[PDB]
Amino acid sequence: RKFFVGGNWKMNGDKKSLGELIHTLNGAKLSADTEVVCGAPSIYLDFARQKLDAKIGVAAQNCYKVPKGAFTGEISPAMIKDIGAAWVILGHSERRHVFGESDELIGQKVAHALAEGLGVIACIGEKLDEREAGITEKVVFEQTKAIADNVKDWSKVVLAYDPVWAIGTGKTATPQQAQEVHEKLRGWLKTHVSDAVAQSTRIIYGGSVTGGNCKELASQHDVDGFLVGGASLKPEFVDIINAKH
Amino acid sequence: RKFFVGGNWKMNGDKKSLGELIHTLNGAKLSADTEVVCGAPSIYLDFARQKLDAKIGVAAQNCYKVPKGAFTGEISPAMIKDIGAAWVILGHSERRHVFGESDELIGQKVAHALAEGLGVIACIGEKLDEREAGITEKVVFEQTKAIADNVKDWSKVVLAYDPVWAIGTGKTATPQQAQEVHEKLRGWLKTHVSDAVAQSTRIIYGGSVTGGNCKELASQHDVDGFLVGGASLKPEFVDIINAKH
């Protein structure tokens, strides 16, 4: 499984600051073995695709479930492809908990994006009260099934385990907590889908990943990469990409 | 009051078809007495601003309420301005009823966009059930108040009366039902804000406006222009712009 590192810029930047970030990335010594994707604000996807080396992928941070229509404020997979971006992040925690996107909606978006040819980075993760109540497994398998029941071709899917309590809080999961969930998710995949799908699907970890804690998380057997937030806007993003060196 | 015509492209277009539309608008003879604004999909805001003649303004179809932060999928007023866009459409019916944005949130969005120096096109309008119930006034005044409560300076606000039952259905409001609400909204402003605000704020009508309909709508004394959806993607958009000529 090729190591995968996604940087989720979220709602940050302007042309000057993203321009510099991009300059840095195009010049950096990035591992030949890491697949890199930058998640840019919709307003800057064209710019980013124009500026980043072709070796680095571009992802939209969200999309709707039909190619066109009366959905003021939304963008579709067709438009994302039009600009040259090849991925979309769906089901991120902020979409679920701040904007109210349900599993039903997320699963409809995944099927559409995939039908249109985009790769999908599908996020799942439990909240602190769920973790403490001992139902992490129940929650992540329910979120994963909603996605999985809408996936016809797993070759372009990346699963991202983003425990809510860890996003932007500095409270990274320990290597052991991450490994535990990843291993379980891989297991779900083997019995609900197939062994072939289980072995080739990347499951990445997100939630307060830094240049300082990445090497330990990355040595875990079932951690295939990361979905970086806050640190994807900094130069250390380069150290993250190279977490195996 | 300068006649105002805004075209809301909604979730439509690609670089090819939008380039086409923009070339049409750039070569058309548009009335000098009409303020024209095109609301493009976020992904094409930069593109649109770079290709359109300077006399045509560009609007974002939506924005969030803070300058930056952990809001995957959202854009801010600072980003819109970065691109050179001068307006944002907020409170659109699709945002309210498909994406569940509340009056409270819409108000926070207006306050922030205005603080950031953008012009705001704020939408209000009742549903068919409300109209039939005879509570059109109750509903629009409440939505208007939610906006008003967040407007310090009315010089960069355009109120858009967009009855939900008229949006994309083909069921245009009659010239008399549009005038009746506009007049009532203008009176609301007069008594709740000021005579001067009342006199100067443009109140535009949206909901199945066509080249065929526009002239009679535009002749109503309190109808200051239109918010066009479906017809904004056609040649006839030109005729709408020129409705008073």
From Swiss-Prot, chains A, B:
Active-site residues, Swiss-Prot/TrEMBL: H92 (electrophile), D162 (proton acceptor)
UniProt EC number: 5.3.1.1, 4.2.3.3
SUPFAM superfamilies: Triosephosphate isomerase (TIM)
GO molecular function terms attached to this record: methylglyoxal synthase activity; protein homodimerization activity; triose-phosphate isomerase activity; ubiquitin protein ligase binding
Pathway: Carbohydrate degradation; glycolysis; D-glyceraldehyde 3-phosphate from glycerone phosphate: step 1/1; Carbohydrate biosynthesis; gluconeogenesis
Pfam families named in the record: TIM (PF00121)
UniProt keyword list: Cytoplasm, Gluconeogenesis, Glycolysis, Isomerase, Lyase
Organism superkingdom: Eukaryota
Catalytic reaction equation(s): dihydroxyacetone phosphate = methylglyoxal + phosphate; D-glyceraldehyde 3-phosphate = dihydroxyacetone phosphate
GO cellular component, one term: cytosol
UniProt-listed InterPro entries: Aldolase_TIM, TIM_sf, TrioseP_Isoase_bac/euk, Triosephosphate_isomerase, Triosephosphate_isomerase_AS
Subcellular location: Cytoplasm
Any one biological process term the GO annotation gives: methylglyoxal biosynthetic process
Residues given in the record as substrate binding sites: N8, K10
Subunit structure: Homodimer.
Role of this protein: Triosephosphate isomerase is an extremely efficient metabolic enzyme that catalyzes the interconversion between dihydroxyacetone phosphate (DHAP) and D-glyceraldehyde-3-phosphate (G3P) in glycolysis and gluconeogenesis. It is also responsible for the non-negligible production of methylglyoxal a reactive cytotoxic side-product that modifies and can alter proteins, DNA and lipids.
UniProt similarity note: Belongs to the triosephosphate isomerase family.
Protein name: Triosephosphate isomerase
Species of the source: Gallus gallus
